[PDB]
Amino acid sequence: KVPEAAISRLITYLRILEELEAQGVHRTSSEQLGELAQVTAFQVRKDLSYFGSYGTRGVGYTVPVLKRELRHILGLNRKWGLCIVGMGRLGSALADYPGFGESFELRGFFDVDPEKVGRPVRGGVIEHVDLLPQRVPGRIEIALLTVPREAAQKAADLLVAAGIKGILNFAPVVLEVPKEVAVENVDFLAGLTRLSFAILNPKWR
Amino acid sequence: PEAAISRLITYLRILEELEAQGVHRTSSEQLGELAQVTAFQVRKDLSYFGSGYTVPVLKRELRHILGLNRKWGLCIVGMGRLGSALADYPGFGESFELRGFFDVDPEKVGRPVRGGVIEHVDLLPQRVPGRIEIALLTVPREAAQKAADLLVAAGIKGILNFAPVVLEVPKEVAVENVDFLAGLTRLSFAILNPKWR
Numbered sequence: 324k325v326p327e328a329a330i331s332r333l334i335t336y337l338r339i340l341e342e343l344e345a346q347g348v349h350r351t352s353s354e355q356l357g358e359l360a361q362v363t364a365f366q367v368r369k370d371l372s373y374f375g376s377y378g379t380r381g382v383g384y385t386v387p388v389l390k391r392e393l394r395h396i397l398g399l400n401r402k403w404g405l406c407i408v409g410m411g412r413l414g415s416a417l418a419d420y421p422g423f424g425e426s427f428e429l430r431g432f433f434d435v436d437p438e439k440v441g442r443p444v445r446g447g448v449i450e451h452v453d454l455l456p457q458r459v460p461g462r463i464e465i466a467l468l469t470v471p472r473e474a475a476q477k478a479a480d481l482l483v484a485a486g487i488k489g490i491l492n493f494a495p496v497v498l499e500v501p502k503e504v505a506v507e508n509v510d511f512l513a514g515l516t517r518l519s520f521a522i523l524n525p526k527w528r
Numbered sequence: 529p530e531a532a533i534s535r536l537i538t539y540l541r542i543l544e545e546l547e548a549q550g551v552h553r554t555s556s557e558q559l560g561e562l563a564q565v566t567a568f569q570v571r572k573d574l575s576y577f578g579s580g581y582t583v584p585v586l587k588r589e590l591r592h593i594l595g596l597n598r599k600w601g602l603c604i605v606g607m608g609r610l611g612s613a614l615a616d617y618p619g620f621g622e623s624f625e626l627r628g629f630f631d632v633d634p635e636k637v638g639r640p641v642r643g644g645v646i647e648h649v650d651l652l653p654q655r656v657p658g659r660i661e662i663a664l665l666t667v668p669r670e671a672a673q674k675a676a677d678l679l680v681a682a683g684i685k686g687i688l689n690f691a692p693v694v695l696e697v698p699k700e701v702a703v704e705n706v707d708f709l710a711g712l713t714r715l716s717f718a719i720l721n722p723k724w725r
């Protein structure tokens with residue numbers, strides 16, 4: 324039983340590994356990765372423990388191998404197809420975020436208002452949500468839900484139908500879906516506490 | 529331990545919920561259990577500060593440590609798609625209250641926003657001190673650094689950065705980067721592991 328916090332740290336090592344591969348760094352360690360994730364080296368070695376023997380020998384790790392290894396663990400070895408249903412303000416912005424990644428790709432921006440439905444979008448065009456059933460299966464697994472709160476639970480159930488794999492949900496309402504699909508809720512303001520604490524702790528900061 | 533703060537935050541969440549449910553008292557064994565961490569640890573974290581326990585007292589204690597006691601002034605610099613949407617987001621409330629919305633777009637200055645109103649950016653130094661400490665930087669990559677430059681001069685205490693760029697700001701100013709990205713992978717991993725889920 325791997326802790327939820329463990330997968331989040333794993334997610335952090337990977338991000339720290341591409342940053343490393345961006346500086347021509349080839350091999351690293353649990354001591355370096357930890358100092359960068361702000362955790363104890365033991366924690367890095369530990370989190371990796373939940374998934375098999377890693378960098379056993381003193382040696383350490385080599386950015387390339389671990390980076391690959393972590394991508395496999397977090398399931399980032401495939402290329403998930405993404406869609407943003409609820410093409411409003413957040414939607415239009417999200418739809419244009421620069422660094423989505425090599426394993427995540429947008430392939431559909433949906434929406435119900437006719438005013439938009441049909442306008443070009445950096446890579447494709449908006450389109451109604453009545454085609455969700457034969458636009459999702461082969462190419463879309465993950466749906467970014469930036470639809471108004473009230474509409475959320477209704478646009479949500481629509482996806483579960485066109486067979487959506489997972490839902491990254493930005494609306495302030497707890498979706499109701501079958502175990503067949505995963506829901507991850509976003510909270511852009513989550514970091515305000517980290518910030519709050521940092522302001523009161525210069526010395527620490 | 530830079531990692532303790534993240535746990536401490538987890539504890540408070542586990543507490544605020546224990547309270548809402550009516551539970552009166554908890555212990556190191558339970559907090560840990562619910563926070564997926566050893567009692568030894570939880571008991572050790574609360575050690576760096578003030579030290580079973582009573583959900584109400586520890587909650588208040590944790591909140592005081594985390595800063596959530598006072599009521600901070602917030603603001604969004606850059607009322608574009610992200611920033612505009614953010615304004616109408618009903619998730620602040622508590623100890624972070626929105627008290628300003630700025631932008632450079634002259635055709636945006638004046639827009640009636642939630643009772644307030646989109647100011648410009650030049651008043652920051654007079655509008656900031658005493659009223660606002662935290663700014664949600666939601667401007668194009670290209671701007672950001674120059675934006676923060678003002679904000680600092682305006683006397684900003686901390687920035688919650690959405691701009692995908694690592695800002696360069698003096699030490700008196702705390703910065704925190706915000707990303708949805710991580711939740712995507714948590715999603716990714718969560719899909720291939722219905723068991724874990």
Ligand SMILES: NC(=O)c1ccc[n+]([C@@H]2O[C@H](COP(=O)([O-])OP(=O)(O)OC[C@H]3O[C@@H](n4cnc5c(N)ncnc54)[C@H](O)[C@@H]3O)[C@@H](O)[C@H]2O)c1
Pocket residue numbers: 408409410411412413414433434435436439452468469470471472474477478493494495509510511512612613614616617
């Ligand atoms: N989690 C956060 O930190 C955060 C911050 C930003 C905004 N909000 C969320 O943003 C979402 C949208 O916000 P916005 O501020 O840009 O709103 P918006 O009103 O500009 O856009 C909403 C869009 O939803 C579309 N829509 C409504 N029902 C739909 C349906 N059934 N299917 C497809 N499209 C539908 C509309 O046509 C519109 O384009 C809300 O869920 C809100 O809670 C959350």
Ligand SMILES: NC(=O)c1ccc[n+]([C@@H]2O[C@H](COP(=O)([O-])OP(=O)(O)OC[C@H]3O[C@@H](n4cnc5c(N)ncnc54)[C@H](O)[C@@H]3O)[C@@H](O)[C@H]2O)c1
Pocket residue numbers: 415416417419420421605606607608609610611630631632633649666667668669671674675689690691692706707708709
């Ligand atoms: N972290 C995330 O999850 C996330 C997702 C949304 C978008 N992005 C980032 O959010 C930011 C805004 O995205 P958007 O889609 O709303 O774009 P946008 O073009 O609508 O908004 C940027 C806004 O900044 C304003 N601006 C420019 N220079 C300024 C300055 N010097 N001072 C004050 N305001 C200024 C503009 O007038 C505009 O309204 C970008 O940096 C983008 O890359 C991040």
Ligand SMILES: [Ca+2]
Pocket residue numbers: 402404461462
């Ligand atoms: Ca595919």
Ligand SMILES: [Ca+2]
Pocket residue numbers: 601658659
């Ligand atoms: Ca004040």
